[PDB]
Amino acid sequence: SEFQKVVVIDAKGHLLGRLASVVAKQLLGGQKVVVVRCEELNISGHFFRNKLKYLAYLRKACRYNPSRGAFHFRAPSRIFQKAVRGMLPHKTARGQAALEHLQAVEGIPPPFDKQKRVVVPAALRVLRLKPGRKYCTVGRLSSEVGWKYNDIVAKLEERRKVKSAAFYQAKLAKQKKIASAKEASPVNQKLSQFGY
Amino acid sequence: VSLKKKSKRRTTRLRSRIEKKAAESKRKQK
Amino acid sequence: SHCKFEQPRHGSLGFLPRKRASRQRGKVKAFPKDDASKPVHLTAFLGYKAGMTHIVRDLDRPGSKMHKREILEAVTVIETPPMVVVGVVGYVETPRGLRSLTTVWAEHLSEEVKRRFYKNWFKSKKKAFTKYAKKYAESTQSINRELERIKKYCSVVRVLAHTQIRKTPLAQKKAHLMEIQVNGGSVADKVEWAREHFEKTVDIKSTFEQNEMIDVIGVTRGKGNEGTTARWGTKHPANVQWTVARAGNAGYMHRTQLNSKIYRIGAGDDAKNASTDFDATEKRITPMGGFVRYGVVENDFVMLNGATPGPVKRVLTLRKSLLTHTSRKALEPVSLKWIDTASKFGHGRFQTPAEAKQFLGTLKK
RNA sequence: GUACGUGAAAUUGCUGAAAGGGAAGCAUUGGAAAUCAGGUCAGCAUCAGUUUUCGGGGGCGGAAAAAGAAUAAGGGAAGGUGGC
RNA sequence: CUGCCGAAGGCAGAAACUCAGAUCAGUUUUAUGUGUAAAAUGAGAGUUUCUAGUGGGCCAUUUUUGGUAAGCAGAACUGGCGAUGCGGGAUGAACCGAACGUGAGGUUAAGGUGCCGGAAUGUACGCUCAUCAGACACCAGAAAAGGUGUUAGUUCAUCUAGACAGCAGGACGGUGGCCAUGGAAGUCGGAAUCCGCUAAGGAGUGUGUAACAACUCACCUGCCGAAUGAACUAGCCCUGAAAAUGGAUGGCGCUUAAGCGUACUACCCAUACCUCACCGUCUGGGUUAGAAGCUCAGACGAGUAGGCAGGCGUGGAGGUUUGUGACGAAGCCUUGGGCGUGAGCCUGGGUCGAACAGCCUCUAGU
RNA sequence: GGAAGUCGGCAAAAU
RNA sequence: GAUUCCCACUGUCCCUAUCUACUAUCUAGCGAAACCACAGCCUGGGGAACGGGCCAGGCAAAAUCAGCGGGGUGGCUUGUGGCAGCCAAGCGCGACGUUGCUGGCUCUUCCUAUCAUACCGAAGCAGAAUUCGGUAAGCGUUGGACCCACUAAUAGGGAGCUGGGUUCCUACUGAUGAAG
RNA sequence: AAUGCCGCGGAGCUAUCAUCUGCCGGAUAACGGCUGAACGCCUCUAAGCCAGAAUCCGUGCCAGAAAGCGACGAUUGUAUAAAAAUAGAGGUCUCUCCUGUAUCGUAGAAGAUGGGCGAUGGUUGAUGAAACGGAAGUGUUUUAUUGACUUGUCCAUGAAAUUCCAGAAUCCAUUGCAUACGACUUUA
């Protein structure tokens, strides 16, 4: 709980509204936020109801120049951005600057796949939803509302998980070597009465 | 999204008219 | 209050805005789906609308009202000189779309394609691609690296090809350069095919084969600013909406004619291209007196059914159909019987001067 | 300099400074730049007035808390322990 | 320009003088029946006189009669509005708080603490899943009710003499009872609907057959081992119709809530409350060591009609300032400085060229 | 093709 | 003179197309006026009058050109009538039942409460043809004097013009256009 | 001869008065079923599944953000990277989680100058070469050569009166595939 320049949030298993509210409060506090893996955000309510909610959202359009009408964004990252910006005073310079401090992406791009990704417990579905309750996935609602990049993200995420697993195995082996040398070192038992 | 056909929010004449005519209903049943 | 007498909408909402196309060359907004089961093959070609004529062919259409009768059809003649492959582009699939990772160019670029990079070729010092030619001569290992990058990371392979506009009887000297996606095979196979096709010409004889169904795409003729009458077919307090027909640009829009049949792919070097098995009578596809406002066709040409967008001497793109559609019209063969090459500059009455001379008397000249 | 004392405002041009994504104006606080002016600004201690927030000690009340613990009687049993 | 007093649907103020009173009260007790009379608390109480403005209306409240599909109409009182800014209810003439001088600090009311938004994604116990949920606000119009949705209850039922259900079986013989008929045997159709046996087999619950026949229940036996059933009430949930462009619990959104109900803390801030400073008005005490002054103390502060008082500025007149001025009067411009709550005043710089100003009175084409 | 338009041969053509 | 009829004629019409001149366009010169609190996007709300200013949202990027003229009062309501009696779940009423009697010519879009087309369920539905009902508004719903044809059908509604009857700016549409 | 009148009349324009062209993937609604409880039977529904309308969403087609972007060409202490589930995970039959209050790092006149003792390590800088990383590769490893500093431990010097916080394009010209004017398409 210390002020970092950039917080990378792995949005897997989170709730859209709860994560948006927490992020919107951090941006007004003046913190750069990168919400990666937005195709895994969870929304309460069963999938058919959520798709009806979204398909009702498409209905809002101008009767003159739908080019000026409401802009319906189908990407899961843009869905999260719409949720976040609705919780911000974006009509003012403060809120407009706050939006510039948020980077919502699909998947985990290489500039952010090699950085620690914290999670928000106040938005996690496992901790915040009663078991036995129906929910949906934004990355699934997006595919059946118009989003057309689901397959590429899934493929590029399988590659990323494979590479990350290889990296962790190498780091775990090095950590095992360091861990083995730990008790071999003597001061770790000689004067460890301080609790370390 | 509202996801409704009829808005759940009410106009000020409409909300005021309830207390106008709900009281009269109690007057009538009295 | 409801509308008393209803009619269908005077226009099509799927073709607006009726604005001028931001391009003169027909854009391919969709290439046919790729498959690794089939190895390499191209999918598009670039030609010039020379002119249009009419033909007579025997219709073998089972079940038709005119089965095995002689039918007359209008045909469009597009001159298609071979195009030179001068580049390859690699496209990588990203969660944001297809992105051009890198581009590799051939060492020797003709003045035809070099003119495309300038608005004024004569004033320029012609410095384009000079250092690229230098590095190509010095070290080929670098170029091998980008091709290795293309075959290792890129998912879509496209070849930059330019048309030899010099061969055509056109007053324009700039060559039209476009990308044709190499469909089929592995990415490595496409990269190799591009390499061994660098600086060589690919002809319509290798792209299309005289019977398939293609999509012809181009920019239509310009009719200028027009009122609601001919732009749209026109006979409560509010503000005017986008659906209301209005006065503005009519013509010069990017269009796509689907399901065009090649009736014939003729070779320029052959002098029998306008002759059929029922006709003999040695002649060329160019009509008597030359095509009106285009010239004489001397290269490979394609004869499509019906009419294609745009006036004469405009560039058209011919692509393979995205989706297979096995209508018996798209599957039947074509056996030409007669081709009309009379003078289209007026009421022509003779096919060739040779056969006109016997009927006419001995002209004093 | 006669289109002539002094020569305001509306309005206009130039120069310099600044701002500008479907209004502009104004007010409050402060920053930034410019400018003017006169001792200026701090820290701590001991106090007084107002006030907020923690901590300790001591009485006095209730069924002289109720409980509870420890320890002697008797009674009852279980959601029945060892045993049977 | 500022200050004070301040309405009206006979008032508010001014002046003239009573009594230091039992003299009055939009009040409550006591006694007699909302009337009257004689303890509580508060307040200094008063009488004659004249003189501005107004005599309207909207909203709600409780008392009645006439009423009707349905609202509705006519009275009396009460307040709020009108003359009233401020906090909250997303915003608002009538809803919840709160009556306003300039500031500092503290604390609250109403409403709130997921984000927009200052404040607990607090604690504790329950309810609810809605393919057009809820945040609504006597849930009053639809409203009478429907639901194999859920959670609680209330009243009657059988149950290790074996409960409900489940499978196995019996579910009969007089009799195909009698009229009724092509054909009707319990089951097209007309009254019952009796009996031998029981533990039970209904002149028969339905299907079916031309008629039959066959199966089923409603009725009993075998196995199987524990709870089960019926009728009502309550809360939430679905439904209980509504159209015409996009769409609104304020938005985003929220489903062990950020919805519904309760309980307990903590927290947020109004011009409201408290402490202090200051401004002004009023009131009271004192003052012979600009009296038109000095001094101490307390309370008070919206303001239309209206009433009263004190000041700023303009032209001209009388008096005065040994008043200002070609070494620059008046005027004008100014991102300069200063004073006053304000009307306004002084001043620096520039321009400019011949008059001008303070103080006390007078005067007005101010 | 020949008033099928319009409330209707308004206006042109038949001369 | 009016009316009717038959013949005759023709861009009134099916159904518009083409051609010419002028204007409009640009340019050189000259050069106004009306009007003007300020202005300029829409949706829902703001008790009303909803408005452009207020609330909550969609949005929002200089400077411009040519067109065209848009903008200057119940949460009502719907499909089932009036009188009397018999019950009677229940709390004198009493629900359902039950019985007694006499304006038209063209126009953008939306709603479904669907005439046709698509797919389903039921019916003595053998087949064909058909009836009713469900999802369904994607797409159509004509030509002539209620009449007679065509058509698969000729379904119902919400938000420029003429006849008989009374004595600037903004929007929409196209066209440029400085700029990281 | 104000297009005197008439016939034909290329080019252009144009006519359902002429010719051509108009396509396939998911998710569902009514509805028909599978398994299967609730309720020891049954049941299309409660958890799940299948088929299913001209319907909805995409593909295709048009436009291209003039404040979205990529490739190509020429160029006059800013410390910490598995994944997945939560009615379960991982490690060697056994053990661990039950939160980062953790881990790495952390002295020095802002990091000075020397002396030892102990180890071949750490910080690594500079270059030099190998490999890897394309989703926006914003970098990663591997080294090599060295120049450094080497708190590992133990000693000696100085700090202070900072004496109480602060090469191109365009105009002119040309073209007619275009056109009110711009723009566009060519030449130059």
Curated annotation (Swiss-Prot), chain A:
The Gene Ontology terms for molecular function here are: mRNA binding; structural constituent of ribosome
**Main location group:** cytoplasm
> Carries keyword Transcription regulation?
no
- Which InterPro entries does the UniProt entry name for this protein? Ribosomal_uL13, Ribosomal_uL13_CS, Ribosomal_uL13_euk/arc, Ribosomal_uL13_sf
Task: Extract one GO cellular component term from the record.
Answer: cytosol
Which UniProt keywords are present, listed alphabetically? Cytoplasm, Phosphoprotein, Ribonucleoprotein, Ribosomal protein
Q: A GO biological process this protein is involved in?
A: cytoplasmic translation
- In the record, Phosphoserine modifications are located at 192
- Cell location: Cytoplasm
Superkingdom field: Eukaryota
Q: Which Gene3D superfamilies match?
A: 6.10.250.3250, Ribosomal protein L13 (3.90.1180.10)
HAMAP family linked to this entry: Ribosomal_uL13
Q: Which PANTHER family match?
A: LARGE RIBOSOMAL SUBUNIT PROTEIN UL13, RIBOSOMAL PROTEIN L13
The protein's job, in short, is:
Component of the ribosome, a large ribonucleoprotein complex responsible for the synthesis of proteins in the cell. The small ribosomal subunit (SSU) binds messenger RNAs (mRNAs) and translates the encoded message by selecting cognate aminoacyl-transfer RNA (tRNA) molecules. The large subunit (LSU) contains the ribosomal catalytic site termed the peptidyl transferase center (PTC), which catalyzes the formation of peptide bonds, thereby polymerizing the amino acids delivered by tRNAs into a polypeptide chain.
Q: Which family does it belong to?
A: Belongs to the universal ribosomal protein uL13 family.
- Note, other: There are 3 genes for uL13 in S.pombe.
Summary of subunit composition and partner proteins: Component of the large ribosomal subunit (LSU). Mature yeast ribosomes consist of a small (40S) and a large (60S) subunit. The 40S small subunit contains 1 molecule of ribosomal RNA (18S rRNA) and at least 33 different proteins. The large 60S subunit contains 3 rRNA molecules (25S, 5.8S and 5S rRNA) and at least 46 different proteins.
Identification of the protein by name: Large ribosomal subunit protein uL13B
Q: Which gene encodes it?
A: rpl1601
From Swiss-Prot, chain B:
State the deletion phenotype: 20-40% of cells exhibit morphogenetic aberrations represented by irregular, uneven, or overdeposition of septum material as well as septation and cell separation defects, often resulting in pseudofilamentous or multiseptated cells, suggesting a failure of cytokinesis in those cells. Cultures of null mutant cells did not appear to exhibit a growth arrest.
Q: What's the entry's take on its domains? A: In contrast to other GTP-binding proteins, this family is characterized by a circular permutation of the GTPase motifs described by a G4-G1-G3 pattern.
The job of this chain, per UniProt, is described as: Required for optimal growth. Required for normal processing of ribosomal pre-rRNA. Required for nuclear export of ribosomal protein rpl2501.
Q: Where is it located?
A: Nucleus, Nucleolus
Regions of biased composition (Basic and acidic residues) lie at 16-26
Q: Which domain of life is it from?
A: Eukaryota
Q: Look up and give the organism this protein is from.
A: Schizosaccharomyces pombe (strain 972 / ATCC 24843) (Fission yeast)
Residue span relative to the full protein: 2 to 31 of 470
Bias-annotated ranges (Basic residues):
1-15
Q: What is this protein called?
A: GTPase grn1
What protein family does this chain belong to? Answer: Belongs to the TRAFAC class YlqF/YawG GTPase family.
Curated annotation (Swiss-Prot), chain C:
- Positions of the region Disordered? 1-33
Which SUPFAM superfamilies does this chain map to? Translation proteins
- Residues annotated as carrying Phosphoserine in the record are 12, 64, 139, 142, 206, 275, 335
Mind telling me which InterPro entries this protein's record contains?
L3_arc_euk, Ribosomal_L3_dom_3_arc_sf, Ribosomal_uL3, Ribosomal_uL3_CS, Transl_B-barrel_sf
Q: Where in the cell is it found?
A: Cytoplasm
GO-annotated cellular components:
cytosol; cytosolic large ribosomal subunit; preribosome
* Assembly mode: Component of the large ribosomal subunit (LSU). Mature yeast ribosomes consist of a small (40S) and a large (60S) subunit. The 40S small subunit contains 1 molecule of ribosomal RNA (18S rRNA) and at least 33 different proteins. The large 60S subunit contains 3 rRNA molecules (25S, 5.8S and 5S rRNA) and at least 46 different proteins. uL3 forms together with ES39L one of the contact sites for the signal recognition particle that targets ribosomes to the endoplasmic reticulum membrane.
Its annotated function is as follows: Component of the ribosome, a large ribonucleoprotein complex responsible for the synthesis of proteins in the cell. The small ribosomal subunit (SSU) binds messenger RNAs (mRNAs) and translates the encoded message by selecting cognate aminoacyl-transfer RNA (tRNA) molecules. The large subunit (LSU) contains the ribosomal catalytic site termed the peptidyl transferase center (PTC), which catalyzes the formation of peptide bonds, thereby polymerizing the amino acids delivered by tRNAs into a polypeptide chain.
Q: Any further remarks?
A: There are 2 genes for uL3 in S.pombe.
User: What is the protein name given in its UniProt record?
Assistant: Large ribosomal subunit protein uL3A
Species this protein is from: Schizosaccharomyces pombe (strain 972 / ATCC 24843) (Fission yeast)
Cite the source lineage: Eukaryota, Fungi, Dikarya, Ascomycota, Taphrinomycotina
